[PDB]
Design a binder for this molecule. Structure first.
Ligand SMILES: *[C@@H]1O[C@H](CO)[C@@H](O)[C@H](O)[C@H]1NC(C)=O
Length: 219
């Protein structure tokens, strides 16, 4: 009291993305510090990578509480399918997905340009994560996103990242040759994040407003 946040089997990635095995951590109160195991099992259910992961762990050492803000409600994506799930993130024998993320896919045999924006009027700096899906092959690319030749652009006043998916056969991990590469940014108060993609975007539905700052950290 104030108690630590013990992640148990969950990694910081699993917690923030909302790996379904980490559902116990969907809403957490203020903590004194964060306790993570040396090699947590529950991280990226759909396999992949997380850019600047150590730097995110260092930022979390100075955060003592988050408030999840619904920055991009799933219903806003009216021209895309948002129900996308995988057996890699299965819940009760059914395909599912990261709780805080949205897999945008083709709807009615079309993937029109996906655009979304959020103005940080939350009252504090906000951590936002998004992903890029790197399929296993061109057949997978066309099935999910209609065509080969796509991009994912994310921008703020301090960020300009415009990614191209890498289509490549890979050894199966968690039943998948595809990979999802996640990145993060800190959106300043009153700044706007803009998302634009012609395919392969794993959009956040939530952002994490930094509600309490303080020293102690991550064990
Ligand atoms: C974001 O919201 C703040 C509200 O205080 C406003 O000052 C600013 O104009 C907004 N950004 C845009 C792009 O409208």
């Amino acid at each position: 009291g104030i108690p630590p946040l013990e992640l148990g089997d969950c990694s910081i990635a699993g917690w923030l993305l909302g790996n379904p095995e980490c559902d116990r951590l969907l809403s957490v109160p203020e903590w004194s510090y964060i306790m993570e195991k040396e090699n947590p099992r529950d991280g990226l259910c759909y396999p992949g990578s997380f850019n600047d992961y150590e730097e995110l762990k260092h930022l979390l050492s100075s955060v003592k509480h988050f408030e999840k803000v619904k920055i991009l409600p799933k219903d806003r994506w009216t021209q895309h399918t948002t129900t996308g799930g995988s057996r890699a993130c299965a819940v009760s024998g059914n395909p599912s997905f990261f709780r805080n993320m949205v897999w945008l896919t083709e709807k009615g045999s079309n993937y029109p340009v996906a655009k979304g924006s959020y103005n940080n009027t939350s009252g504090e700096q906000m951590l936002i994560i998004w992903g890029v899906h790197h399929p296993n092959d061109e057949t997978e690319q066309r099935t999910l996103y209609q065509n080969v030749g796509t991009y994912v652009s994310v921008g703020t006043s301090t960020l300009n990242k415009r990614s191209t998916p890498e289509i490549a056969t890979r050894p199966k991990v968690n039943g998948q040759g595809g990979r999802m590469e996640f990145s993060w940014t800190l959106l300043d108060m009153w700044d706007t994040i803009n998302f634009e993609s012609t395919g392969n975007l794993i959009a956040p539905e939530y952002g994490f407003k930094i509600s309490k700052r303080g020293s102690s950290g991550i064990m």
